[PDB]
């Protein structure tokens, strides 16, 4: 059914499927310890995860997949998806990451957690890049869907996934042409957007090794769901 949608219908479907922005826990006395920051972030990430899973079901084509393939794709892409969402909502806050409306952090606060500032810097650089490209909401939702379908497709049905992926590419180009971009500008912008996905994969892998580290350090107990999504990368 995803294959018969127009570009504008694809955009509407994706826009409509967007998960909500969640709030962090409250009056958690600034300043943060390593343990308290990790606590908040873990609690937040866990809740975002539940919403992401339901968002995925609303991504055209995704439900046409077998359960096993849906699981595979989500286990592969979950952190990439949380990350791109984070940088998207951080766009209008240069220098800071908007984990939640009531939790906006700069890199100095990322120092409170051992090894986190490196990933912070990369997330901020990504936000800065989106900002400079003037990334649009319609483009963002396309990218996030691409991540869901693409990241795990090579560790496998595949043909259908690639068809859907092709459709989203069509959708992206459609959008750029509407913005008045020339043919050359369209392929250049398409290229630029898709190359950032490589950096996002990178941030995810570095973030992953790291969640594993803190688990080991058992500073804060990770949620059952996070641990599951985490162990899948092993």
């Amino acid at each position: 059914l995803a294959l018969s949608l127009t570009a504008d219908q694809m955009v509407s479907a994706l826009l409509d499927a967007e998960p909500p922005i969640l709030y962090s826990e409250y009056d958690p006395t600034r300043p943060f310890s390593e343990a308290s920051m990790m606590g908040l972030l873990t609690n937040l990430a866990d809740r975002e995860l539940v919403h992401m899973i339901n968002w995925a079901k609303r991504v055209p084509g995704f439900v046409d997949l077998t359960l096993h393939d849906q699981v595979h794709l989500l286990e592969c892409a979950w952190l990439e998806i949380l990350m791109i969402g984070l940088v998207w909502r951080s766009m209008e806050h240069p220098g800071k990451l908007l984990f939640a409306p009531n939790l906006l952090l700069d890199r100095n606060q990322g120092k409170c957690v051992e090894g986190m500032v490196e990933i912070f810097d990369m997330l901020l650089a990504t936000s800065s890049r989106f900002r400079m490209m003037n990334l649009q909401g319609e483009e963002f939702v396309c990218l996030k869907s691409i991540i869901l379908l693409n990241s795990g497709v090579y560790t496998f049905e595949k043909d259908h996934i690639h068809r859907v992926l092709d459709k989203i590419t069509d959708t992206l180009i459609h959008l750029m042409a509407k913005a008045g971009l020339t043919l050359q500008q369209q392929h250049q912008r398409l290229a630029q957007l898709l190359l950032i996905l490589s950096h996002i994969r990178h941030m995810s892998n570095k973030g992953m090794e790291h969640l594993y580290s803190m688990k080991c350090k058992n500073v804060v107990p990770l949620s059952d769901l996070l641990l599951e999504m985490l162990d899948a990368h092993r």
Binding site: V50, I53, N54, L67, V71, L74, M229
Partner: peptide, 10 residues
Amino acid sequence: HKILHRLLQD
């Protein structure tokens, strides 16, 4: 068994 499984089939 997976929590993901449950969340996925709701």
